[PDB]
Amino acid sequence: SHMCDAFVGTWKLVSSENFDDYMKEVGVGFATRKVAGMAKPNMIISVNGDVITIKSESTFKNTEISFILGQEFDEVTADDRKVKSTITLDGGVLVHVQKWDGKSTTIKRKREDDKLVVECVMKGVTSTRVYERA
Numbered sequence: 348s349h350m351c352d353a354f355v356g357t358w359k360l361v362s363s364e365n366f367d368d369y370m371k372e373v374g375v376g377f378a379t380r381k382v383a384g385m386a387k388p389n390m391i392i393s394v395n396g397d398v399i400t401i402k403s404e405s406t407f408k409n410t411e412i413s414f415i416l417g418q419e420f421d422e423v424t425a426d427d428r429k430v431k432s433t434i435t436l437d438g439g440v441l442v443h444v445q446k447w448d449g450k451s452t453t454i455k456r457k458r459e460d461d462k463l464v465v466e467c468v469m470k471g472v473t474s475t476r477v478y479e480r481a
């Protein structure tokens with residue numbers, strides 16, 4: 348009955364494109380790129396009141412963030428960046444901006460048909476990662 352109902356659930360990665368190049372653009376080093384690129388995460392999205400929780404569970408790393416839309420928080424990313432994050436809803440798309448070291452990357456999550464599509468963008472480089480219900 349609310350703001351992210353169609354995102355809530357357990358999702359499994361089924362395809363990726365350009366993720367190595369995205370990670371290079373971000374600054375991720377060779378060994379982490381190789382092991383992270385192999386991961387097939389489950390993304391678990393839940394909502395309790397105003398608080399949204401997004402977990403990512405994989406052989407590479409298990410991460411968890413909780414947040415309120417529009418309210419900045421500090422995040423340690425799976426690749427060990429210490430970033431300041433703000434997540435908003437823009438026309439039904441969750442938009443996640445991460446700022447660190449004068450740099451920025453944006454991760455968009457959208458529902459398309461029965462998929463949850465994640466678009467990671469750093470400068471001119473996009474990676475598209477497609478999730479199915481688990």
Ligand SMILES: c1ccc2c(c1)c1c(n2CCc2nnn[nH]2)CCCCCC1
Nearest residue numbers: 370375383386388403424425426465476
């Ligand atoms: C496996 C799954 C998910 C991951 C990662 C690794 C990494 C991130 N995300 C979250 C964004 C996301 N969600 N689905 N794919 N990407 C941080 C940005 C990219 C650097 C590598 C580490």
